[PDB]
Amino acid sequence: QGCCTDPRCRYQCYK
């Protein structure tokens, strides 16, 4: 929602 949307965090989110 917040960081998950970002690319830098998306890596961690592993969507």
PDB file of N, CA, C and O in Angstrom:
ATOM      1  N   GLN A   1       0.838  -1.230   0.000  1.00  0.00           N
ATOM      2  CA  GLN A   1       0.000   0.000   0.000  1.00  0.00           C
ATOM      3  C   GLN A   1       0.872   1.280   0.000  1.00  0.00           C
ATOM      4  O   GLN A   1       0.606   2.224  -0.744  1.00  0.00           O
ATOM      5  N   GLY A   2       1.903   1.289   0.839  1.00  0.00           N
ATOM      6  CA  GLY A   2       2.784   2.438   0.919  1.00  0.00           C
ATOM      7  C   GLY A   2       4.137   2.178   0.286  1.00  0.00           C
ATOM      8  O   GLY A   2       4.485   2.789  -0.725  1.00  0.00           O
ATOM      9  N   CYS A   3       4.902   1.270   0.882  1.00  0.00           N
ATOM     10  CA  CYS A   3       6.226   0.931   0.372  1.00  0.00           C
ATOM     11  C   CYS A   3       6.131  -0.132  -0.718  1.00  0.00           C
ATOM     12  O   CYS A   3       6.894  -0.115  -1.685  1.00  0.00           O
ATOM     13  N   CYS A   4       5.192  -1.057  -0.556  1.00  0.00           N
ATOM     14  CA  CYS A   4       4.997  -2.129  -1.525  1.00  0.00           C
ATOM     15  C   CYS A   4       4.839  -1.566  -2.934  1.00  0.00           C
ATOM     16  O   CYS A   4       5.239  -2.194  -3.915  1.00  0.00           O
ATOM     17  N   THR A   5       4.251  -0.377  -3.028  1.00  0.00           N
ATOM     18  CA  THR A   5       4.038   0.270  -4.317  1.00  0.00           C
ATOM     19  C   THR A   5       5.358   0.729  -4.925  1.00  0.00           C
ATOM     20  O   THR A   5       5.508   0.768  -6.147  1.00  0.00           O
ATOM     21  N   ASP A   6       6.312   1.072  -4.069  1.00  0.00           N
ATOM     22  CA  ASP A   6       7.622   1.525  -4.524  1.00  0.00           C
ATOM     23  C   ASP A   6       8.441   0.360  -5.070  1.00  0.00           C
ATOM     24  O   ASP A   6       8.274  -0.791  -4.666  1.00  0.00           O
ATOM     25  N   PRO A   7       9.347   0.664  -6.011  1.00  0.00           N
ATOM     26  CA  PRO A   7      10.209  -0.345  -6.634  1.00  0.00           C
ATOM     27  C   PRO A   7      11.253  -0.892  -5.667  1.00  0.00           C
ATOM     28  O   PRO A   7      11.468  -2.102  -5.589  1.00  0.00           O
ATOM     29  N   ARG A   8      11.899   0.006  -4.930  1.00  0.00           N
ATOM     30  CA  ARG A   8      12.922  -0.387  -3.969  1.00  0.00           C
ATOM     31  C   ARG A   8      12.362  -1.381  -2.955  1.00  0.00           C
ATOM     32  O   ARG A   8      13.058  -2.297  -2.518  1.00  0.00           O
ATOM     33  N   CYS A   9      11.099  -1.191  -2.585  1.00  0.00           N
ATOM     34  CA  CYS A   9      10.444  -2.070  -1.623  1.00  0.00           C
ATOM     35  C   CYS A   9       9.812  -3.269  -2.323  1.00  0.00           C
ATOM     36  O   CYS A   9       9.750  -4.365  -1.766  1.00  0.00           O
ATOM     37  N   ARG A  10       9.345  -3.053  -3.548  1.00  0.00           N
ATOM     38  CA  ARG A  10       8.715  -4.115  -4.325  1.00  0.00           C
ATOM     39  C   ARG A  10       9.599  -5.359  -4.358  1.00  0.00           C
ATOM     40  O   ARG A  10       9.101  -6.484  -4.350  1.00  0.00           O
ATOM     41  N   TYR A  11      10.909  -5.147  -4.397  1.00  0.00           N
ATOM     42  CA  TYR A  11      11.864  -6.253  -4.432  1.00  0.00           C
ATOM     43  C   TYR A  11      11.582  -7.100  -3.175  1.00  0.00           C
ATOM     44  O   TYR A  11      11.416  -8.316  -3.260  1.00  0.00           O
ATOM     45  N   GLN A  12      11.531  -6.439  -2.023  1.00  0.00           N
ATOM     46  CA  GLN A  12      11.271  -7.124  -0.762  1.00  0.00           C
ATOM     47  C   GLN A  12       9.862  -7.705  -0.738  1.00  0.00           C
ATOM     48  O   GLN A  12       9.652  -8.832  -0.289  1.00  0.00           O
ATOM     49  N   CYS A  13       8.898  -6.930  -1.224  1.00  0.00           N
ATOM     50  CA  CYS A  13       7.508  -7.368  -1.258  1.00  0.00           C
ATOM     51  C   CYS A  13       7.359  -8.644  -2.081  1.00  0.00           C
ATOM     52  O   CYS A  13       6.534  -9.504  -1.769  1.00  0.00           O
ATOM     53  N   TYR A  14       8.164  -8.760  -3.131  1.00  0.00           N
ATOM     54  CA  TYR A  14       8.120  -9.931  -4.000  1.00  0.00           C
ATOM     55  C   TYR A  14       6.701 -10.191  -4.494  1.00  0.00           C
ATOM     56  O   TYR A  14       6.221 -11.325  -4.473  1.00  0.00           O
ATOM     57  N   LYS A  15       6.033  -9.132  -4.940  1.00  0.00           N
ATOM     58  CA  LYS A  15       4.669  -9.243  -5.442  1.00  0.00           C
ATOM     59  C   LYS A  15       4.599 -10.208  -6.621  1.00  0.00           C
ATOM     60  O   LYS A  15       5.268 -10.012  -7.635  1.00  0.00           O
TER      61      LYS A  15
END
